[PDB]
Amino acid sequence: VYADSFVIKGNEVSQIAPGQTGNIADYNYKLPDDFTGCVIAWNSNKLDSKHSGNYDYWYRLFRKSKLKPFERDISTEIYQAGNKPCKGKGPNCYFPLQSYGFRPTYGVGHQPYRVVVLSFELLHAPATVCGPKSTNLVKNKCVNFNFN
Amino acid sequence: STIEEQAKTFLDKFNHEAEDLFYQSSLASWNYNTNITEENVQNMNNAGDKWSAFLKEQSTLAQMYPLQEIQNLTVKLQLQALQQNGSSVLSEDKSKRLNTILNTMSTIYSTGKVCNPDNPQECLLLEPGLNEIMANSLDYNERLWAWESWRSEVGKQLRPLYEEYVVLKNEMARANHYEDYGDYWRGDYEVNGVDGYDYSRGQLIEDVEHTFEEIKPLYEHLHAYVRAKLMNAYPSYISPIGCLPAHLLGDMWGRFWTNLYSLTVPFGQKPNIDVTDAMVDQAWDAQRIFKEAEKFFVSVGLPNMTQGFWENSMLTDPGNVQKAVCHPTAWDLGKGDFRILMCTKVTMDDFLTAHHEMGHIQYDMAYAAQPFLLRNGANEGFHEAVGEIMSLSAATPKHLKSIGLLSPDFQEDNETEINFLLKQALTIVGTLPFTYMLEKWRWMVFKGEIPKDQWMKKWWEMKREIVGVVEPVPHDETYCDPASLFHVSNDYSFIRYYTRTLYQFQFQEALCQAAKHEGPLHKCDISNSTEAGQKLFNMLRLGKSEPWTLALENVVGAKNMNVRPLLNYFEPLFTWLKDQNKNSFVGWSTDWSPYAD
């Protein structure tokens, strides 16, 4: 069982679903067409908030291609959009990572939300992770029993 | 790669980097307007300097994207809006001098006081001053003095400053590939690129003149009806065939004729509709007014408000050492933050001002999904029209009776309807000819067809020709009276008011015809109707990415402005005025003057 967690805005919650496109579901984290898991999210506005801007969360926005399902990318290169070679930040050279800056004075869709994804795996291996149901014991009676 | 992808990337990055700065500037402005302290002033100045530096570093950099190679309409419009240089084409010395002149004129206009001639120690302010004096007064000499001293004290120290301001504006217009300031003002009503929806800066003047040619008879009849009672009000003062004095229109400038309702009442024996006593007896407050406004706006098919709208807005005057401005303004801070600053009292005008502010907030929330460069209305007076079409619907006797403010034993007669129509006319039509004359005079001054030694002469000629008002005392070319107005001294336009006055009636007729209303037009009500709400939301969601012509055609089915709604609304009042003036005289002579005898 794998547990994936990330922090996004209130409007980007609908993008985390099998069969969705955009910026977060195509450049930061993409889900495959088939995924037998659960998506859990909640409001964390009062937890992750600070006055004068909270510039601690980053995200990838500009890239040359898209991300495959279950792919990691921690590249910090300079994106190129023209025909001239990259020689530092300037014309046609922008930083791929941007900050959010969450504040407790925003609306209802511009708040930080913590989303947790749980992935299940079943291969040719013993299953030591099960789920939960025990009753009492009676004696001197013709009853039905079940001992493991 | 291509230029379109780079342009879209640059626009997205600009929006992402400017949204936070705009939010910070709005928060600083809100903190300055809520609490007047030195720290708030410093924070507002710092935010303004940062925004100016951002606009400077973003300008003169996006010029690498030609407009002749862009095929997308939205991208082309955004690039054209971002490539506007502005006052940066001039030198630093000229810009500094212009800013100094602007600050000096603002300080002079904001600091005004008139002292008594017989007692130099008795100096009165403006608002606890000449405004309250002209509000309630029954003397001729007092109003004449309050007009003459006002137009002579604050109307003789702004002539060369205004001349230099006009010269600098003309130079800036000629430097930005324009003709004059009038072209820069009319450039907002320009749509190029879409076939069948083009609009130039010359057709608007023709349409305004064509509408004025039909409005003029109604204004003449109204002026005759007003003079018929003004002759009996002030004996030996009003001429039977002459014009009217400038210090008797109701206020200092004579823009609104609301103060003349007490003297021009058709039937004084009939009671008036005052829901103030009912609200005092029921012990209401601003919260109840806002709740009623919300229930009214939701019943037509509009979403509810947010929690921050109620937990962050200031809807009650604190009444303490903390000073604030009680001017009702709509604020759009962004990121889902909408606040209203208003000192709401238990009166009748506040009940309509709350609905106006709620309509402004709904309009601002309508285009919340548009990009940062498109979060604006299709026209300047569009927000005011959307607010007025709701304020007039909320000010109907049926709506007040359905909520329990009016007694069920009220018998609606014809005299009450005539009085209501006259009160609405003296407020709506009483400002259209003056606005048109002032706008035409400003356009002729900015164009350069009027010599410098004939400004006041042409001003008084246009006055006596359009408005029909003669001055009590002749003034030479040393005065600067036309520049004594707030909108004139702060670089504001006036065609927006006329466009809003037309669009409000157009939208009212559209909504009353779409809701399948039967009977008179002044008895129409858009309450409990989802079709009209959906039809309005289908147009408010456009914002600024679509031309105003298409948005108007999708609502009323027309591309240009029309005056038929106003005529259909005032037909009963017009017939009543004609029946009353059948035994009276219509017209006025421009040769008569109070200083002729």
Coordinates of all heavy atoms in Angstrom, one line a residue, chain B residues 284-331:
Chain B
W284 N -35.4 47.9 12.8 CA -34.5 47.2 11.9 C -33.1 47.8 12.0 O -32.8 48.7 12.8 CB -35.0 47.3 10.5 CG -36.2 46.4 10.2 CD1 -36.9 45.7 11.1 CD2 -36.7 46.0 8.9 NE1 -37.8 44.9 10.4 CE2 -37.7 45.1 9.1 CE3 -36.4 46.4 7.6 CZ2 -38.4 44.6 8.0 CZ3 -37.1 45.9 6.5 CH2 -38.1 45.0 6.8
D285 N -32.2 47.3 11.2 CA -30.8 47.7 11.1 C -30.2 47.4 9.8 O -31.0 47.0 8.9 CB -30.0 47.1 12.3 CG -30.1 45.6 12.3 OD1 -30.9 45.0 11.5 OD2 -29.4 44.9 13.1
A286 N -28.9 47.6 9.6 CA -28.3 47.3 8.4 C -28.3 45.8 8.0 O -28.3 45.4 6.9 CB -26.8 47.8 8.4
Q287 N -28.2 45.0 9.1 CA -28.2 43.5 8.9 C -29.5 43.1 8.2 O -29.5 42.2 7.3 CB -27.9 42.8 10.2 CG -26.6 43.1 10.8 CD -25.4 42.6 10.1 OE1 -25.6 41.7 9.2 NE2 -24.3 43.2 10.3
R288 N -30.6 43.6 8.7 CA -31.9 43.2 8.1 C -32.0 43.7 6.7 O -32.6 43.0 5.8 CB -33.0 43.8 8.9 CG -34.4 43.4 8.4 CD -34.6 41.9 8.4 NE -35.9 41.5 8.0 CZ -37.0 41.3 8.8 NH1 -36.9 41.5 10.1 NH2 -38.2 41.0 8.2
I289 N -31.5 44.9 6.4 CA -31.5 45.4 5.0 C -30.7 44.5 4.1 O -31.1 44.2 3.0 CB -31.0 46.9 5.0 CG1 -31.9 47.8 5.8 CG2 -31.0 47.4 3.6 CD1 -31.5 49.2 5.9
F290 N -29.5 44.1 4.5 CA -28.7 43.3 3.7 C -29.3 41.9 3.5 O -29.2 41.3 2.5 CB -27.3 43.2 4.3 CG -26.3 44.2 3.9 CD1 -26.3 45.4 4.6 CD2 -25.5 44.1 2.8 CE1 -25.4 46.5 4.2 CE2 -24.7 45.1 2.3 CZ -24.6 46.3 3.0
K291 N -30.0 41.4 4.6 CA -30.6 40.1 4.4 C -31.8 40.2 3.4 O -32.0 39.3 2.6 CB -31.1 39.6 5.8 CG -30.0 39.1 6.7 CD -30.6 38.7 8.0 CE -29.5 38.2 9.0 NZ -28.7 37.1 8.4
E292 N -32.5 41.3 3.5 CA -33.6 41.4 2.5 C -33.1 41.6 1.1 O -33.6 41.0 0.1 CB -34.5 42.6 2.9 CG -35.3 42.5 4.2 CD -36.4 41.4 4.0 OE1 -36.8 41.2 2.9 OE2 -36.8 40.9 5.1
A293 N -32.0 42.3 0.9 CA -31.4 42.5 -0.4 C -30.9 41.1 -0.9 O -31.0 40.8 -2.1 CB -30.2 43.5 -0.3
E294 N -30.3 40.3 0.0 CA -29.8 39.0 -0.4 C -31.0 38.1 -0.8 O -30.9 37.4 -1.8 CB -29.0 38.3 0.7 CG -28.5 36.9 0.4 CD -27.7 36.3 1.5 OE1 -27.6 37.0 2.6 OE2 -27.2 35.2 1.3
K295 N -32.1 38.1 -0.1 CA -33.2 37.3 -0.4 C -33.9 37.8 -1.7 O -34.4 37.0 -2.5 CB -34.3 37.4 0.7 CG -33.8 36.7 2.0 CD -34.9 36.8 3.1 CE -36.0 35.7 2.9 NZ -37.0 36.1 1.8
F296 N -33.8 39.1 -2.0 CA -34.3 39.6 -3.3 C -33.4 39.1 -4.4 O -33.9 38.7 -5.5 CB -34.4 41.1 -3.2 CG -34.9 41.7 -4.5 CD1 -36.2 41.7 -4.9 CD2 -33.9 42.3 -5.4 CE1 -36.6 42.3 -6.1 CE2 -34.3 42.9 -6.6 CZ -35.7 42.9 -6.9
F297 N -32.1 39.2 -4.3 CA -31.2 38.9 -5.4 C -31.1 37.4 -5.6 O -30.7 37.0 -6.7 CB -29.8 39.5 -5.1 CG -29.6 40.9 -5.6 CD1 -30.1 41.9 -4.8 CD2 -29.0 41.1 -6.8 CE1 -29.9 43.2 -5.3 CE2 -28.8 42.4 -7.2 CZ -29.3 43.5 -6.5
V298 N -31.4 36.6 -4.6 CA -31.3 35.1 -4.8 C -32.6 34.6 -5.5 O -32.6 33.7 -6.2 CB -31.1 34.4 -3.4 CG1 -31.3 32.9 -3.6 CG2 -29.7 34.7 -3.0
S299 N -33.7 35.3 -5.2 CA -35.0 34.9 -5.8 C -35.0 34.9 -7.3 O -35.9 34.3 -7.9 CB -36.2 35.7 -5.2 OG -36.0 37.1 -5.5
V300 N -34.1 35.6 -7.9 CA -34.0 35.8 -9.4 C -33.1 34.8 -10.0 O -33.0 34.7 -11.2 CB -33.7 37.2 -9.8 CG1 -34.6 38.2 -9.2 CG2 -32.2 37.5 -9.5
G301 N -32.4 34.0 -9.2 CA -31.5 33.0 -9.7 C -30.0 33.3 -9.6 O -29.2 33.0 -10.5
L302 N -29.6 33.9 -8.5 CA -28.2 34.3 -8.3 C -27.6 33.5 -7.1 O -28.4 33.2 -6.1 CB -28.0 35.8 -8.0 CG -28.5 36.7 -9.2 CD1 -28.3 38.2 -8.8 CD2 -27.7 36.4 -10.5
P303 N -26.4 33.2 -7.1 CA -25.8 32.4 -6.0 C -25.7 33.3 -4.7 O -25.9 34.5 -4.8 CB -24.4 32.1 -6.5 CG -24.4 32.2 -8.0 CD -25.4 33.3 -8.3
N304 N -25.4 32.6 -3.6 CA -25.3 33.3 -2.3 C -24.0 33.9 -2.2 O -23.1 33.8 -3.0 CB -25.6 32.3 -1.2 CG -26.9 31.6 -1.4 OD1 -27.9 32.1 -1.9 ND2 -27.0 30.3 -0.9
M305 N -23.8 34.6 -1.0 CA -22.6 35.3 -0.7 C -21.6 34.3 0.0 O -22.0 33.2 0.4 CB -22.8 36.5 0.1 CG -23.6 37.6 -0.7 SD -22.6 38.2 -2.1 CE -23.7 39.5 -2.8
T306 N -20.4 34.8 0.3 CA -19.4 34.0 1.1 C -19.4 34.5 2.5 O -19.9 35.5 2.9 CB -18.0 34.2 0.4 OG1 -17.7 35.6 0.4 CG2 -18.1 33.7 -1.0
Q307 N -18.7 33.7 3.3 CA -18.5 34.0 4.7 C -17.6 35.2 5.0 O -17.9 36.0 5.9 CB -18.0 32.7 5.5 CG -17.9 32.9 7.0 CD -17.4 31.6 7.7 OE1 -17.1 30.7 7.0 NE2 -17.4 31.7 9.0
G308 N -16.6 35.3 4.2 CA -15.7 36.5 4.3 C -16.4 37.8 3.9 O -16.0 38.8 4.4
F309 N -17.5 37.7 3.1 CA -18.2 38.9 2.8 C -18.9 39.5 4.0 O -19.2 40.7 4.1 CB -19.2 38.6 1.7 CG -20.1 39.7 1.3 CD1 -19.7 40.7 0.4 CD2 -21.4 39.8 1.8 CE1 -20.5 41.8 0.1 CE2 -22.2 40.9 1.4 CZ -21.8 41.9 0.6
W310 N -19.3 38.6 4.9 CA -20.0 39.0 6.2 C -19.0 39.2 7.4 O -19.3 39.9 8.3 CB -21.1 38.1 6.5 CG -22.2 38.0 5.5 CD1 -22.2 37.2 4.4 CD2 -23.4 38.8 5.4 NE1 -23.3 37.4 3.7 CE2 -24.1 38.3 4.3 CE3 -23.9 39.8 6.2 CZ2 -25.3 38.9 3.9 CZ3 -25.2 40.3 5.9 CH2 -25.8 39.9 4.7
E311 N -17.9 38.5 7.4 CA -17.0 38.5 8.5 C -15.9 39.6 8.3 O -15.1 39.8 9.3 CB -16.3 37.2 8.7 CG -17.3 36.1 9.2 CD -16.6 34.8 9.6 OE1 -15.4 34.7 9.4 OE2 -17.3 33.9 10.1
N312 N -15.8 40.2 7.2 CA -14.7 41.2 6.9 C -15.2 42.5 6.5 O -14.5 43.5 6.4 CB -13.7 40.7 5.8 CG -13.1 39.4 6.3 OD1 -12.8 39.1 7.5 ND2 -12.7 38.5 5.3
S313 N -16.5 42.7 6.1 CA -17.1 43.9 5.7 C -17.4 44.8 6.9 O -17.8 44.3 7.9 CB -18.3 43.7 4.8 OG -18.0 43.0 3.6
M314 N -17.4 46.1 6.6 CA -17.7 47.1 7.6 C -19.1 47.8 7.2 O -19.1 48.6 6.4 CB -16.7 48.2 7.8 CG -17.0 49.3 8.8 SD -15.6 50.5 9.0 CE -14.3 49.4 9.4
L315 N -20.2 47.3 7.8 CA -21.5 47.8 7.5 C -22.1 48.6 8.6 O -23.3 48.9 8.6 CB -22.4 46.6 7.2 CG -21.9 45.6 6.2 CD1 -22.9 44.5 5.9 CD2 -21.5 46.3 4.9
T316 N -21.3 49.1 9.6 CA -21.8 49.9 10.7 C -20.8 50.9 11.0 O -19.6 50.6 11.2 CB -22.2 49.0 11.9 OG1 -23.1 48.0 11.5 CG2 -22.7 49.9 13.0
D317 N -21.2 52.2 11.2 CA -20.3 53.3 11.5 C -19.8 53.1 13.0 O -20.6 53.0 13.9 CB -21.0 54.6 11.4 CG -20.0 55.8 11.3 OD1 -18.9 55.7 12.0 OD2 -20.3 56.8 10.6
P318 N -18.5 53.0 13.2 CA -18.0 52.7 14.6 C -18.3 53.9 15.5 O -18.8 53.7 16.7 CB -16.5 52.6 14.4 CG -16.3 52.2 13.0 CD -17.4 52.9 12.2
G319 N -18.1 55.1 15.1 CA -18.4 56.3 15.9 C -17.4 56.4 17.0 O -17.8 56.5 18.2
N320 N -16.1 56.5 16.7 CA -15.1 56.6 17.7 C -14.0 57.4 17.2 O -14.1 58.1 16.2 CB -14.7 55.2 18.2 CG -14.1 55.2 19.6 OD1 -14.8 55.3 20.6 ND2 -12.7 55.0 19.7
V321 N -12.8 57.4 17.8 CA -11.6 58.1 17.3 C -11.2 57.7 16.0 O -10.5 58.4 15.3 CB -10.5 58.1 18.4 CG1 -10.9 58.6 19.7 CG2 -10.0 56.6 18.5
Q322 N -11.5 56.4 15.6 CA -11.1 56.0 14.3 C -12.0 56.6 13.2 O -13.2 56.5 13.2 CB -11.3 54.4 14.2 CG -10.5 53.7 15.2 CD -10.7 52.2 15.1 OE1 -10.1 51.4 15.9 NE2 -11.5 51.7 14.2
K323 N -11.3 57.3 12.3 CA -12.0 58.0 11.2 C -11.9 57.3 9.9 O -10.9 56.6 9.6 CB -11.3 59.4 11.0 CG -11.4 60.3 12.2 CD -10.8 61.7 12.0 CE -11.7 62.6 11.2 NZ -11.8 62.3 9.8
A324 N -13.0 57.3 9.1 CA -13.1 56.6 7.9 C -14.0 57.4 6.9 O -14.7 58.3 7.3 CB -13.6 55.1 8.0
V325 N -14.0 57.0 5.6 CA -14.8 57.6 4.6 C -16.1 56.8 4.5 O -16.0 55.6 4.2 CB -14.0 57.7 3.3 CG1 -14.9 58.4 2.2 CG2 -12.7 58.4 3.5
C326 N -17.2 57.5 4.6 CA -18.5 56.8 4.5 C -19.0 56.8 3.0 O -20.2 56.6 2.8 CB -19.5 57.6 5.4 SG -19.3 57.2 7.1
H327 N -18.2 57.0 2.1 CA -18.6 56.9 0.7 C -18.8 55.5 0.2 O -17.8 54.7 0.3 CB -17.6 57.6 -0.2 CG -18.0 57.7 -1.7 ND1 -19.2 58.3 -2.0 CD2 -17.3 57.4 -2.8 CE1 -19.3 58.2 -3.4 NE2 -18.2 57.7 -3.8
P328 N -20.0 55.1 -0.2 CA -20.2 53.7 -0.6 C -19.4 53.4 -1.9 O -19.6 54.0 -3.0 CB -21.7 53.7 -0.9 CG -22.3 54.8 -0.2 CD -21.2 55.9 -0.3
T329 N -18.5 52.4 -1.7 CA -17.6 52.0 -2.9 C -17.6 50.5 -2.9 O -17.6 49.8 -1.8 CB -16.2 52.6 -2.7 OG1 -15.7 52.3 -1.5 CG2 -16.2 54.1 -2.9
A330 N -17.5 49.9 -4.1 CA -17.3 48.5 -4.3 C -15.9 48.2 -4.5 O -15.2 48.7 -5.3 CB -18.1 48.0 -5.5
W331 N -15.4 47.2 -3.7 CA -14.0 46.8 -3.7 C -13.9 45.4 -4.1 O -14.6 44.5 -3.7 CB -13.3 47.0 -2.3 CG -13.3 48.4 -1.8 CD1 -14.2 49.0 -0.9 CD2 -12.4 49.4 -2.2 NE1 -13.9 50.3 -0.7 CE2 -12.8 50.6 -1.5 CE3 -11.3 49.5 -3.0 CZ2 -12.1 51.8 -1.6 CZ3 -10.6 50.7 -3.1 CH2 -11.0 51.8 -2.4

